[PDB]
Design a protein around this ligand. Structure first.
Ligand SMILES: O=C(NO)[C@@H](O)[C@H](O)[C@H](O)COP(=O)(O)O
Ligand SMILES: O=C(NO)[C@@H](O)[C@H](O)[C@H](O)COP(=O)(O)O
Ligand SMILES: [Zn+2]
Ligand SMILES: [Zn+2]
Lengths: 188, 188
């Protein structure tokens, strides 16, 4: 039988750039219906339309046992009080776990179950996050520099964005009274 | 609707230590039949018996789609001309892939197919190695300081050490004339 070729790729923990990877870019305009403050979103899109995050994904065929890996560069910023975040998703195969290795910056992960059980995990360089089966996950940049991390996930996990896209997470991550706060989403 | 708890753990990139992890120690005396120079192995065991490597593992139950992670501290040394290495294994579920992230030191990975064809991947801090389905894998420390890396692998992958314990890899990594060389294993 044919065996796939092993490879190494150098990843600058300062940039998150992977050569040979599929690069995807999310601007604020790619994120309509995601942030609580809709008027703040609209204004920011018209003034700047900032890049919220970039992903460098090295992806295999959707086979059991195989592994994908991707870095994310999550840029600093706010939409009103709400910190820049990733869209967030469940996996297409719900019971697929994931491992995150925080590389640069200050951020965290919001995770929630299909029942809306909600978890916040602080992330700083060296933080490894176990994302268990069934937990949807969004990363958040709570600092003023790029938040960079590596994600390793089953090649057959898939990305399920729909239910998060309409309903969001049960918690939001805001700056209020000079504090980073994880509070109940009002639109939830 | 029981779900497992998400968590974050600090991995120290300088030392490899994961506080709370399952720590494993492998001494040279636990590696009979692994190095070409058996007399050199015997002597180094009788006089010192160094730790060759340590593993800090965060493991889940053996379920499909779940993920384990572990750091290895592979200490610097030689047995005769042959650099210290990990025992090396195939996965019990052969088609399970793996992703390594090099954190500190100077090393590399020896990989081989069930047919004994071998590959070498140099690893320096920042190197991410994709270990494809079906490839056995051994890491080697080619420098004078600890070689430290993080591995992420399917939780149902398992470890099979059998044929490697008997026959090793078809290639060896040695120092010869002040130079690191990947050469054919004379035993093969
Ligand atoms: O969790 C991952 N992979 O499965 C990550 O690689 C995410 O896919 C990545 O950070 C981008 O975020 P969204 O996919 O939520 O837009
Ligand atoms: O590949 C891994 N996990 O599957 C690694 O975590 C290895 O198990 C670890 O580096 C120790 O090497 P041996 O298992 O060959 O002694
Ligand atoms: Zn995911
Ligand atoms: Zn392995």
């Amino acid at each position: 039988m044919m065996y796939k070729e092993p490879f190494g790729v150098k990843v600058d923990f300062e940039t998150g750039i992977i050569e040979g990877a599929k690069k995807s870019v999310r601007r604020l305009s790619d994120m309509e219906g995601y942030f609580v403050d809709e008027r703040a979103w609209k204004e920011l899109v018209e003034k700047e339309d900032p890049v919220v995050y970039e992903v460098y994904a090295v992806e295999q065929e959707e086979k059991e046992g195989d592994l994908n890996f991707a870095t994310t560069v999550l840029y600093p910023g706010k939409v009103g009080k709400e910190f820049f975040f990733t869209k967030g998703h469940f996996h297409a195969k719900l019971d697929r776990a994931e491992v995150y290795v925080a590389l640069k910056g200050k951020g965290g992960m919001l995770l929630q179950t299909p029942e809306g059980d909600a978890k916040w995990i602080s992330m700083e360089p060296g933080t490894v996050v176990y994302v268990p089966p069934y937990w949807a996950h969004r990363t958040v940049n709570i600092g003023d520099e790029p938040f960079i991390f590596l994600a390793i996930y089953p090649a057959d996990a898939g990305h399920d964005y729909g239910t998060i896209a309409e309903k969001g997470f049960s918690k939001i991550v805001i700056e209020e009274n000079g504090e980073v706060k994880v509070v109940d989403n009002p639109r939830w």
